[PDB]
Design a binder for this molecule. Structure first.
Ligand code: MG
Ligand code: MG
Ligand code: MG
Ligand code: MG
Ligand code: MG
Ligand code: MG
Ligand code: MG
Ligand code: MG
Ligand code: MG
Ligand code: MG
Ligand code: MG
Ligand code: MG
Ligand code: MG
Ligand code: MG
Ligand code: MG
Ligand code: MG
Ligand code: MG
Ligand code: MG
Ligand code: MG
Ligand code: MG
Ligand code: MG
Ligand code: MG
Ligand code: MG
Ligand code: MG
Ligand code: MG
Ligand code: MG
Ligand code: MG
Ligand code: MG
Ligand code: MG
Ligand code: MG
Ligand code: MG
Ligand code: MG
Ligand code: MG
Ligand code: MG
Ligand code: MG
Ligand code: MG
Ligand code: ZN
Ligand code: ZN
Lengths: 120, 69, 149, 114, 91
RNA sequence: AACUUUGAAGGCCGAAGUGGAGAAGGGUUCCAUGUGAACAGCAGUUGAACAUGGGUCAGUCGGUCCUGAGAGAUGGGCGAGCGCCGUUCCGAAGGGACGGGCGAUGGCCUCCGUUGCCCUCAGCCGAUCGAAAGGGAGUCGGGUUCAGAUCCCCGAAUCCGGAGUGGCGGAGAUGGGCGCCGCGAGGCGUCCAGUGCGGUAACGCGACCGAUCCCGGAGAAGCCGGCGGGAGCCCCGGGGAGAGUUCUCUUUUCUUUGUGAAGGGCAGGGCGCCCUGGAAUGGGUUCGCCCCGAGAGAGGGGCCCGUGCCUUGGAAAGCGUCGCGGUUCCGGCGGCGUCCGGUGAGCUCUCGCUGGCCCUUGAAAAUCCGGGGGAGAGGGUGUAAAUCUCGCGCCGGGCCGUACCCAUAUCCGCAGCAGGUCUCCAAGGUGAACAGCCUCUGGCAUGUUGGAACAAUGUAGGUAAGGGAAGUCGGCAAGCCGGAUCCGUAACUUCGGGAUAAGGAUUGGCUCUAAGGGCUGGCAGCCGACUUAGAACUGGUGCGGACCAGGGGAAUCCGACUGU
RNA sequence: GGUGGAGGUCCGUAGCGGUCCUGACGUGCGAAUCGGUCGUCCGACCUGGGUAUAGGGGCGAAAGACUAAUCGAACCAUCU
């Protein structure tokens, strides 16, 4: 009889508003909920650090963001990681193109000054 | 109880004066030689039946041999 | 326990026998551990040092004072208290010292005292908020707290 | 569920009567009375909060049974003081003596000038 | 977030003991639990053990200081007077 | 034979028990046999009653030892006096031991012990008592009795003391140079060394001389919160063994499915332990914290607890079934099995880390160990010695208590008295819960008796149309509200509270949807958990359906309060 | 917006205590008990044992309360 009842409890039954005598903190406490969410998200950032996927600085910033209650789960945190990856990819591509243009300009100026000191 | 690894150390243990008796427990996949000294019960686990049969003839005649069953 | 002043285990070396002596000095405010507290007549005038009153100059803030030479410290040795040297007297070897009550006392110049104010000062500034704090105050000291009028 | 009783006449849950649960080969649960937890020795200096290493943390009258190497470490101040405070005490015992040598040389130079 | 307006550490006492008495307890109660920068190592580790005794977490070097603070102003003036008398004796 | 016993049925105590065990106390009340004279407020074939007999087995369990708060001798003081004060205070308060010298004895008078004298050395703290819950070395498993079991028996250990001639090994350990012989392997003669060895280090190895003295550690520490590890119990999916149900269904329901102490090894926790190295674009990291040029991350190591897994014990024994005996008196004999996994802020115990609180800082000694010192001993190259906390071997551990009750019947209350009395163990569901209710193990007969009717007054529960305090000194009593979720919450205030203010809505069942995770190789595969939110359908609007479980608001006086 | 868990903090189990029904009982279970309702339940909390204070004395968060069912001066014996 207990197994037949707890199968319905696993399905989501006999757990409505009426059959509930304790508070939410009594049933599933918010401290243990915070514990579970920290144990998930901290090891998630730890795996993404150890797999060479995120670096140490963005790791530390998103670690402080995990501590400061920004992300309620793992999915939007993965989406925020991939959005920062797209942003850093675009910024690194523009910075590398600007550095390549600057290096081309500096080497052209160096070769021009070399031709000037070779002629005169 | 102390488990002996070598055959020569078990023979030197059985040669001692404090050795009261030796008994042979023949279960499956093991043969256990137990010698009763004054302080410890020294045991020897042999996985080879031919090695156990060779060791059984190497007991001293003064020591009381008992095949436990 | 039962004392506002903190104490200090000061380890001395015995000059006659090979054995390290230990003493319970009243720690004045500013003494840390691993400090060399000197003691004698030819000692310097600084905090963490006991020297006789005839050697120290005018206006010296001292505590743990002796009323008589030899009794190991009797006067001005509660928490945050000090006695001050007013004036000396070379003839008859006497010294005026005023006490934290305000009384001026003629004390001989032979006896000694540690230099400074007693640590744990300002203890009476915080109010005891409740009967629990007063109960734990006097339970360590002695049975005098249930003051029935 | 096998509820089970003491095997002593001390019925109180005192620090002497500390227990653990253990299963016998006769298939029943019973108390085994635990030994009190001994601690490692603390340093003779008294500045380090940590305890010494290489020494078996056990109750003191057990140390008659332990061997010589089990109770200390093979070092000067072995089993009495930690190695950091040992090497700092060696440094201090060297440098105060060298300072005394420097003071003696300065006293000889003061006698040479005066 | 700022939780209370003008009551800090004394909010554990609730409505009890009076406003002026809690205001007098508040400054001392903050000063005895405020960790202080150690003069020896520099690390903010001066934790109060009991009355007049302060302890550094790094050096493990206990200092006999004030009851509720580390250095009292009277003890600072006493130390200044004692060093002045020491310099006047030494010359 | 209503009460005794057995079987069946129905119940209760419902794991903070009506269960199993202890302390104080009781003192044979414990167990067997017989009796129904007296007691057990009826009875009894029954009993804790009576009469015969039996029952308590320890180096390891306690006392015994130590000291606490304290008590109490000696010196001393006081007192007419029995005596009193006093516990380090007006004391020559030690009888101990290393080494050296001398004589006397005992043993193959070798070499050592015993004592006698002298020299020499020495601090201690107050004689003594004081805990069957404080400190305190070291025993567990199985079986056995009508009554005793960590005590008896068997099998495994372990603590302390002794150990002369040292009973056996191993350490102290046997190496080097020079000169000869020998083709060489190697063998002789002399000279010294040898109170251990290895690692950069944390430190390790099987020992690894050592006194008077000194230093240190253990003994030896509060309360609370949070987290993590490991056990015992509970839960789920299966394999086996036996039972329950099977008029219909159910790969279904119930029980069981193990391994001690003491060693060795390996997981698992902890480190304020060491080496390389020098870091801001600050980094590492916790539930919270916290850490860092006084050395962080990243690598390589070291130590402690290892009560957890494997192995010795040890399957022989224990347990669940099935079968043969002894016609009996029997640790009888034999087949099989005692298996594979996953989980959880789950309850209890324990270990460890980290914080908070104190005008509280949370015990001593017995006893044991380590180190610094270097007074002294050994032997001249060996059939070596002084010295061993190393592995074995031998002997001993004296004295007292041990049965039972431990509480609606073994204690105290004049008693089988609804009172009182200090602790441990702690299942399933429902539920926040160790609340209340039902059930499993265990226990019991309804509490100094039964039968027949259901009168009045009662005691304990309830229900009442309409009114709603008109009753009464007085809303006395009873009743209303009550859990949880979503809103919302005033005057006043010491701004902390009031506050669950007040005032509303929902709550059942069933069928779904969405969200909240690990292991392996933005993706794929394999698995384990309880919650939260939303929707539809439906029941005579019934749904915290029993149980659990705040009536509220506005004012006045007194006392601040918590407490007594 | 989170985390945190402080309080001589609130409801409330055990424990400690005993307001009200001036209920039961009142030649009682009881020379002070029982039922419901109640105060408190992390600290001025409860409690065993050891110990100390002895009668014009002790001790008392103070009621002349308690000091062995005896307290505005305990109990036993003597004067008697
Ligand atoms: Mg919270
Ligand atoms: Mg009092
Ligand atoms: Mg004890
Ligand atoms: Mg086991
Ligand atoms: Mg070691
Ligand atoms: Mg019982
Ligand atoms: Mg019983
Ligand atoms: Mg009987
Ligand atoms: Mg009768
Ligand atoms: Mg006396
Ligand atoms: Mg004694
Ligand atoms: Mg005792
Ligand atoms: Mg590091
Ligand atoms: Mg078997
Ligand atoms: Mg040495
Ligand atoms: Mg018994
Ligand atoms: Mg009865
Ligand atoms: Mg009931
Ligand atoms: Mg009845
Ligand atoms: Mg009956
Ligand atoms: Mg009506
Ligand atoms: Mg009506
Ligand atoms: Mg009226
Ligand atoms: Mg009422
Ligand atoms: Mg109100
Ligand atoms: Mg008015
Ligand atoms: Mg009041
Ligand atoms: Mg409270
Ligand atoms: Mg009445
Ligand atoms: Mg009547
Ligand atoms: Mg009755
Ligand atoms: Mg309350
Ligand atoms: Mg008197
Ligand atoms: Mg009182
Ligand atoms: Mg009066
Ligand atoms: Mg009178
Ligand atoms: Zn140290
Ligand atoms: Zn410091």
């Amino acid at each position: 009889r207990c197994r037949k009842n707890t199968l319905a409890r696993r399905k989501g039954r006999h757990m409505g508003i009426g059959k509930r005598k304790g508070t939410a903190n009594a049933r599933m406490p918010e401290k243990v909920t915070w514990m579970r969410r920290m144990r998930i998200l901290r090891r998630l950032l730890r795996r993404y650090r150890e797999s060479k996927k995120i670096d140490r600085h963005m790791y530390h910033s998103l670690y402080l963001k995990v501590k400061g209650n920004v992300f309620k789960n793992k999915r939007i945190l993965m989406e925020h990681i991939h959005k920062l990856k797209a942003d850093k990819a675009r910024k690194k591509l523009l910075a590398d193109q600007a550095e390549a243009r600057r290096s081309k300009t500096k080497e052209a100026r160096k070769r021009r000054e070399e031709r000037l000191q070779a002629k005169k | 109880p102390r488990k002996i690894e070598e055959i020569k150390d078990f023979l030197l243990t059985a040669r001692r004066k404090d050795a009261k008796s030796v008994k042979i427990k023949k279960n499956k996949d093991n043969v256990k030689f137990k010698v009763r000294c004054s302080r410890y019960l020294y045991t020897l686990v042999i996985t080879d039946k031919e090695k156990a049969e060779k060791l059984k003839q190497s007991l001293p005649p003064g020591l009381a041999v008992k095949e436990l069953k | 326990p039962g004392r506002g002043a903190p104490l200090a285990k000061v380890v001395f070396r015995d000059p006659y026998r090979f054995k390290k002596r230990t003493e319970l000095f009243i720690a004045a405010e500013g003494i840390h551990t691993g400090q060399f507290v000197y003691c004698g007549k030819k000692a310097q005038l600084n905090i963490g040092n006991v020297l006789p009153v005839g050697t120290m100059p005018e206006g010296t803030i001292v505590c743990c004072l002796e009323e008589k030479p030899g009794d190991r410290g009797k006067l001005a040795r509660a928490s945050g208290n000090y006695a001050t040297v007013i004036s000396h007297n070379p003839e008859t070897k006497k010294t005026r010292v005023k006490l934290p009550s305000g009384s001026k006392k003629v004390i001989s110049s032979a006896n000694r005292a540690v230099v400074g104010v007693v640590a744990g000062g300002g203890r009476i500034d915080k109010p005891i908020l409740k009967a629990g704090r007063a109960y734990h105050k006097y339970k360590a000291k002695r049975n005098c707290w249930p003051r029935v009028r | 569920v096998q509820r089970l009783t003491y095997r002593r006449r001390l019925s109180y849950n005192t620090a002497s009567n500390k227990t653990r649960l253990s299963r016998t080969p006769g298939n029943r649960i019973v108390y085994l009375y635990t030994k009190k937890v001994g601690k490692a020795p603390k340093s003779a200096c008294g500045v380090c909060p940590g305890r010494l290493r290489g020494v078996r943390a056990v109750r003191p009258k057990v140390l008659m049974r332990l061997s010589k190497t089990k109770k200390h470490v093979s070092r000067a101040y072995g089993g009495s003081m930690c190695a950091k405070c040992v090497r700092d005490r060696i440094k201090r015992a060297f440098l105060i003596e060298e300072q005394k040598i420097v003071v003696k040389v300065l006293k000889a130079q003061a006698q040479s000038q005066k | 977030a700022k939780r209370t307006k003008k009551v800090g550490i004394v909010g554990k006492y609730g409505t009890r003991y009076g406003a002026s008495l809690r205001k007098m307890v508040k400054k001392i109660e903050i000063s005895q639990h405020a960790k202080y920068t150690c003069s020896f190592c520099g690390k903010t580790k001066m934790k109060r053990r009991a009355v007049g005794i302060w302890h550094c977490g790094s050096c493990m070097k206990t200092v006999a200081g004030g009851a509720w603070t580390y250095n009292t102003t009277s003890a600072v003036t006493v130390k200044s007077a004692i060093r002045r008398l020491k310099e006047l004796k030494d010359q």
